[PDB]
Amino acid sequence: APAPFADFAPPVRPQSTLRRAITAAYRRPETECLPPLVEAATQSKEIRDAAASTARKLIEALRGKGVEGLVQEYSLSSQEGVALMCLAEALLRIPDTATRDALIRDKIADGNWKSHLSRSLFVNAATWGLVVTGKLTSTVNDRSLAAALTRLISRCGEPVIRRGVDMAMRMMGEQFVTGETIREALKRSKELEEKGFSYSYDMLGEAATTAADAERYYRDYESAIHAIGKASAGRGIYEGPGISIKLSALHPRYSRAQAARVMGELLPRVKALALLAKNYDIGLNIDAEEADRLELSLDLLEVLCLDGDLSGWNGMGFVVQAYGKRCPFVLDFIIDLARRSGRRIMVRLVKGAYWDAEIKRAQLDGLADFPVFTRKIHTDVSYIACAAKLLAATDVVFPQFATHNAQTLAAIYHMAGKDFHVGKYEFQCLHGMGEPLYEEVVGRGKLDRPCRIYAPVGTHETLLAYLVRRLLENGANSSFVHRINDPKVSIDELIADPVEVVRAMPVVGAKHDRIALPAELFGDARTNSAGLDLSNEETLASLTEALRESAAMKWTALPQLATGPAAGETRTVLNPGDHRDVVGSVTETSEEDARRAVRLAADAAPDWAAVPPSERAACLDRAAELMQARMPTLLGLIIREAGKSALNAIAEVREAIDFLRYYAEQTRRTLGPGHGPLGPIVCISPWNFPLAIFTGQIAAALVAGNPVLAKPAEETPLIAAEGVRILREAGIPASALQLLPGDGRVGAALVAAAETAGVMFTGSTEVARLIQAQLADRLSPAGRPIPLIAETGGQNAMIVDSSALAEQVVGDVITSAFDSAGQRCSALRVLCLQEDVADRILTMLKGALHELHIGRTDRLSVDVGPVITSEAKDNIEKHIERMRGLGRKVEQIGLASETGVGTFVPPTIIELEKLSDLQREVFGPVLHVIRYRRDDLDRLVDDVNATGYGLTFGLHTRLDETIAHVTSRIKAGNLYINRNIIGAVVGVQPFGGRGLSGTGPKAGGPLYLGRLVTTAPVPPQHSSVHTDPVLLDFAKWLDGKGARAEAEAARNAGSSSALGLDLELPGPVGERNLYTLHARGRILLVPATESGLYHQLAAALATGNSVAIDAASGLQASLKNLPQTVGLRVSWSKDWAADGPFAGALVEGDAERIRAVNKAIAALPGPLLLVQAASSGEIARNPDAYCLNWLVEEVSASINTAAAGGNASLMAIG
Ligand SMILES: Cc1cc2nc3c(=O)[nH]c(=O)nc-3n(C[C@H](O)[C@H](O)[C@H](O)COP(=O)(O)OP(=O)(O)OC[C@H]3O[C@@H](n4cnc5c(N)ncnc54)[C@H](O)[C@@H]3O)c2cc1C
Ligand SMILES: O=C(O)[C@H]1C[C@H](O)CN1
């Protein structure tokens, strides 16, 4: 039995002093990075004057010497220009020229283009939008583009189509790429090579998703090296052409978490390519990618440069990104490696291509700081400082200064001084972008310095995949190329010296004012939880030790009553990934002690309610600080007791911290003396989030003033006991928080106890239904139903159309379906693929499936851990085998023999014919896949809704018409557009669904605390200026019947309702997080009196709902001659079970009537109804007898606005 965490994340090699200096700088404060860069980049006044003169001369030449001319000739609007280029792109998908010209002449020009051109014409319109307008719009208004295309064709005919086709052909064949193939690119390179330029070819591959993809990119690089080497014809690595590669293209799991596979499988591939480049004597450059891949790539560079089989060749090259805080330290490492190996490493200094993605990622992950600068001028100073370091080492490395910025260029030209020879250093630029500048540099008649052109090579499909990111390199508001084209920017502005500008700022190196540190994402409202960087070797080393220490601890969980720990039956808790690993011991609660616990909580209820809300919130904030400090140890317990990966354990502890701080802040915003506690609340928590949901339910109940009986899942008591220890240490009294470990007998006794005043349950729908039936037997002392918040499963779908990017889809599907072994309630269960792209995406999905590592989760390399119990495993496998036996196609990964000691299910893909083939939630790593025809999209949405669930839902599309259609018709609580569907963030995507998925209100949202008090407060931001029009028609009808008081109450309900609330919640960059209040659906009305019915109807209509009114009330004659608008919303029900599903209920009657109706409602099949009851007298006395908070439905929508390849808002931040 391997020792826990003994092999968690060992580094590829011991970290040298130089390597440790790199890691130390990963997230160094920006104010600390800049001063040494300013010093290194300083030059004499004479040089600064000379450089500014050279920069001015270059800029004057640039300003002194396609799409815009076409837009001008045909008087096109922006949208017409975009639509025309999309049409041209589509016409170029037609291979035969004569067939294309005939279609243009005979079909496209004369009328309907739609009739002749499964795939929207406008799939890539975000890219063409950048080309035409210079602005990035993340999604495509395809109806606007269709209108514009019809308009321009009907106005201008074939001539404009011809001009568009020829323009797109030139751009996609000669500007965005040097050529479609390496042979074509090589042919076109001779012209500028004769003028003194050189070339490095970029084959445009990246981000392999499957082994087959990586093999394809490998053979593409190999064939390109042959073509380039044959063409080089012995010119060598400086005069002759080279190749550039991306490591992410060569392996589907290129990450620090998979470092062993990277060194074992990726390294030999790079070696084989490098050996071929050595034989032809050409350059081979390793491009730089995301920040979390930098240090891993150094391990490959180290091995290759030390490998004697590559000796004698100086063509190995490596990019370093000056926007990165580690850049000078990376350069120190590379220069030393060059000295040790004797290889003259070609070092390409760039600024960096992934800036906005790095900002978003650091924010999402809650890390200490960014790994890149946040002010553009800081990157500029960094670049010049790093150029000074490189120019001092030209005997051991070959510096390659890639930049289009004439000020940067001039500074380095003068820094390098007067002595020059080919091979000392060079500049570099991008094909079809940097030549105007560098034609003022190359040649004896200019500055006599060489320039290497980075030349993309590929087909239209390949070049369009990441063209947005490339366009943003030179197209943002702070980009030199954008500014030189802006006439409002003077040459004096362009030649400003960033080194001296930074030196003179008040605070040198200050973070950009408009970019929030991850900790400050929520500003003054609350402090964001902090995560851990699993790509940082210092973090991995310290975590390894903390995790090992956590596994040596004798974890226990006991019945912790108000009076002290109680005795009980004691058993061990075993690691689900390896039952030989005993995690701890649990003593379970007797039924007698559970009943005693409720009585003790009732006795203590006044003393806890008397603790002022601000002080209760302070306990929660203290507990959050304690959990943050304890995170490494908490990770270890979650990993071993609950079977989670480290990554998911971090996110869970973060969620617990976020719940504590969110409910504390919401309390500080709302709770006062009139919002009295319910009383003792029984909190029943699940094993799949045994810290986060455990903590969230309990923290909310406590901070609202209620003592808590905490019943954790039988499988996961240890983390629960630790959460209770932390809450008590933070100041929660033992009488206010009692822990009752055990099985369902304990939960049942707690629910049934007469003093239990409310229940918070997260778990299965079937158990929630049993709890509901027990609670319906009771009323509060006030004679009202006992509140139940019951959050249950989902049958969560994702719809993918032909405009989505397959690589993005597959990554989001693999994560959503198989993360946490599919044991998230949010997990993706049914993937729906548009028929035209289904086979391609399915092939990629199956290939990605087989790259997952399944095993015991005390290793960083494990992607999917065990399921929670043998019973869970057996249930899941029985489903898989039933599907297999029905002839459905089943794909499964093979499991290692080491899995036999635990309870594992392999990630599995099952292809179904129709959604209805799936009849039950399968709570494991099992993705079902269906296909749909585009015209059947609306029926498919019906099929998704038809399950009766409504928790999470995903949509991958670029098309606004499809977003509008699908999001308006889907009925789910948590929507996700162009991203995964898991990991809802407290206060950002408030979490919870409808129908069979939950009662609400949403956890991590602003209505939650109000359900835990007898009189609900007004939540922050909770209002709406919109009045339901059927409500208004009803109020007029009441006035016409003479029911003046009820008409006034109806108008007041119309105003009080928050239906229509539509907010954007603060969160990370590159995402829009929306929170909206809608109608719930059809509310069951059980009135007793005419006035009661009018009040019930007013409340339901003001919140946008329809109603079914109990026909047994005998009140039909009270609703004669309704306006048709109101009649459309009103039905009468004799058989309530036949007329559902309902989305809530309002009941009028005395206590006995309320109890009988509540029991009848619990018997209705389908969703658990949120029931509100009042007596006739309460309706007369209290305008809020029926609270409108519970008659609306919350919807969260999270849209990934960076999905098109970059962040439009961040293009303005420099
Ligand atoms: C030949 C060549 C090879 C390249 N190879 C790579 C590669 O392997 N890896 C890679 O990542 N990119 C690569 N690049 C791209 C390069 O990193 C730049 O993104 C791009 O060339 C524009 O920078 P600049 O010096 O041309 O112009 P500039 O307008 O001077 O600089 C723009 C750059 O400033 C930086 N920046 C913008 N805003 C901010 C901000 N608010 N805070 C901090 N920094 C900011 C960004 O890095 C941005 O790209 C390459 C570029 C060329 C020409
Ligand atoms: O569970 C317990 O009893 C304690 C002991 C150690 O501190 C880990 N938690």
Ligand SMILES: O=C(O)[C@H]1C[C@H](O)CN1
């Ligand atoms: O899995 C998720 O999406 C979130 C929702 C719940 O709070 C548990 N974690």
